């Protein structure tokens, strides 16, 4: 009551070509980053053209709760690249009431973690994993976001 205040988030992941949901739920770190950049890769052009607006772009992602699954995990025990949906709640600073929930989904994901903890003293689980959102030639990708607050 003196000083802190806390909030909550929630994390789901999924696989395409079926309604399979075999992943974590609750990104403790929940580290998110976005970036754009440029270089001299096009350091010279024939001119009289136009532009590409390359920007490179990149979306880093992190979730750490584990407890993936037993049913689908075991079944998989016997490259669609999966997909991710992200859901969080938004509040009004004036009223502080529940009126809107953030609806976020990403088209492409590809988990790739540093497959070695080897911590000298074993940890209390929570195997943080970093993700990178792939993309194809077609269109869109990156993120598609939906918003509540129809009050």
């Amino acid at each position: 009551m003196k000083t802190v205040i806390q909030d909550t988030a929630d994390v789901y992941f999924k696989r395409k070509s079926d309604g399979k949901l075999v992943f974590t739920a609750e990104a403790q770190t929940a580290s998110f980053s976005q970036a754009i950049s440029e270089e001299k890769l096009r350091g010279g052009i024939g001119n009289k053209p136009l532009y590409i607006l390359k920007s490179e772009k990149e979306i880093n992602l992190t979730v750490k709760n584990a407890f993936f699954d037993l049913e689908w995990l075991a079944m998989t025990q016997g490259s669609e690249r999966y997909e991710v949906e992200y859901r969080t709640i938004a509040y009004n600073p004036d009223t502080e009431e529940v009126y809107s929930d953030i609806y976020i989904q990403f088209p492409n994901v590809s988990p790739s973690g540093e497959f070695e903890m080897s911590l000298e003293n074993g940890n209390a689980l929570a195997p943080e994993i970093k993700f990178e959102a792939l993309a194809d030639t077609d269109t869109d990708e990156m993120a598609v976001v939906i918003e509540a607050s129809r009050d």
Partner: protein, 670 residues
Amino acid sequence: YDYHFEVNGTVVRHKNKGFGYMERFFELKESCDERSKLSKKQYERFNALFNFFEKNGVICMAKDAGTLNTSIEINSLAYHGKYDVMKKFIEEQSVSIEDDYKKAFFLACLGRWEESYDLYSNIILNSIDESNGCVYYLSQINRYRIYQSITQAVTQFNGLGLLTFGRHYKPFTDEFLARIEREMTNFNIDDLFNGMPFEFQKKYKILEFLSDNQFLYDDTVKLFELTNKVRSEMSEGSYSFGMSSDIVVLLRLYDNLRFLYENCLWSVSFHEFHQYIRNSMSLLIEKAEYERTRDIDELGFSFFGKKSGFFMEYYDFVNISRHFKIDDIKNLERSCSIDKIRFGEQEKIEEYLVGIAEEITKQFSANGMNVVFYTQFISEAKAALYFAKYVKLSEEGLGKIVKALLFYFPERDLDIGKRYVWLERLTKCNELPKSIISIIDDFLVLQAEKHIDQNYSEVSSNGLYSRDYGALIKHFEKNFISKRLSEITLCLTQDKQKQIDFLFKLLPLLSTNAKSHLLSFKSVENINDLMNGIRIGLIDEFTPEHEELIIEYLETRKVNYIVEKEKGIQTFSSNDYMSTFGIWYFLEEINNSKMEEFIGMDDQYDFFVDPENFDYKKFIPSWLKNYNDKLLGKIAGNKHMKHHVIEVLKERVKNSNDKRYLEILMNYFI
């Protein structure tokens, strides 16, 4: 605790009150006459101690200290990455209890974690029968460590290995997991040193700290004291005579590193030890950056003239090439002008850097991937290739590395779009000889052939694909015709849409006859085809027919927008072209007036189409990072867009260390 051994190789008394029993020994060292007055055995004992202190570097007493220049020379084969020689020494019969100990550590490095325990099992039983408990203690410290690593790995395969590696692996037999999960269930590493003989608790106290984890906790805190002093030195602009606070860090970085590798302690493949290496090194590299850029007030030239810049030698290359990750090395680039720093000992760097190339050939060429060894070595391998862009490589050596990075590295840890990025990064410091273009040429041919199945799609983390692979050719070469690509198109018949459009965007490297014959049955004018067709130089000027399609796209995006607004849905498309079109207008590439009908759809669209009425508060300053000079000149002339862009820049440069905003500011707007 009688004396203190300062890290500079000097000694200073702390608690001694009896005879200066440490003092006299060094007094004998300088005097030659007093060496001869000892008996032969004592003369042998004097040499027995003299040789040791030359190998440990305790030079002289602080009261007569001078300009000390300590050496570092690390000789364990694990450090020097000579993975090939290891397989020859192991394939040999030991001759002593000493020899097996070295092998048990070499087996650990090669990731054959299973057999290591067994030979580690042999040593305990055959170490009881001698007076020499050193091997038996350190036998256990390794034995416990390999156990924990076996538990951590096997769990992580079950947990996330299925999705990471795609399939299921069980490198370790089920029985072994049972046996190890039987043996160590009642072992607490803390008590280990306590239960050893009273003799072992007398002589070898120095080996106490390795028992628990406190040794990294006692060293790690000591660094945190230094990092606070060193940062404090930066914001105060002070000066440090004598033994500077920084060089203490470097000695303490190398001194510790020698102990663990030269005495064959397996701990050095653990995360916490990498943590010490990470912060200890980065602080020094940061310190050099500040030192180069001092302002000079009245004194430095008389003291430090002709800057003795920190030279990053070969013994500095491996450490960065081993312990860092790929994100971490990235961060330094945003906080150091590491291009400027000299990279000495350049001849030596080539061998080890070549050493990774040949090994990467072996593991993936053979059917056998030691998936255990795979984990600890790719991440080391990964950083190595990336960091090469600050060291000069010979032609022949550069032939090996390029031959591997394109071909034999798995698609798992370097996607196609990522592969370009690294290759170019090795084009900075090096030119593009005729040999190199042969390799990248082959990669285009091989990847071209595979892209014939109707579902062998491609992904990217850069959105680059094969298109700019050709660009690296023509940006360096000019007349590369790609014979083999000619035979490809010359034999392509019909109805291979993926192969059609794949080499469509590789037009410039093609041949004259193939071009025309390929201009036949070409992708029509699709909007993707339109821009990408422009990306290859085919389209020179927009026709109204070209514009007609552009109007169609804007209409589609608008009808989507009204659906999105009703549903309250926003998008961020990697192929979002709203921003691209509006710029074409501000430079008069498109003349049709209809663009203004769609003002209010995309914020960056409004920034260019309607500069007079644009809401500059909506301006996101990051867009300028996407804008080339020829826009950044034409941005600086417009009346509607000069009065406001200048202000936001001033705010961020003051409010950020982002030099790129500063670079945009000085040259063009001012």
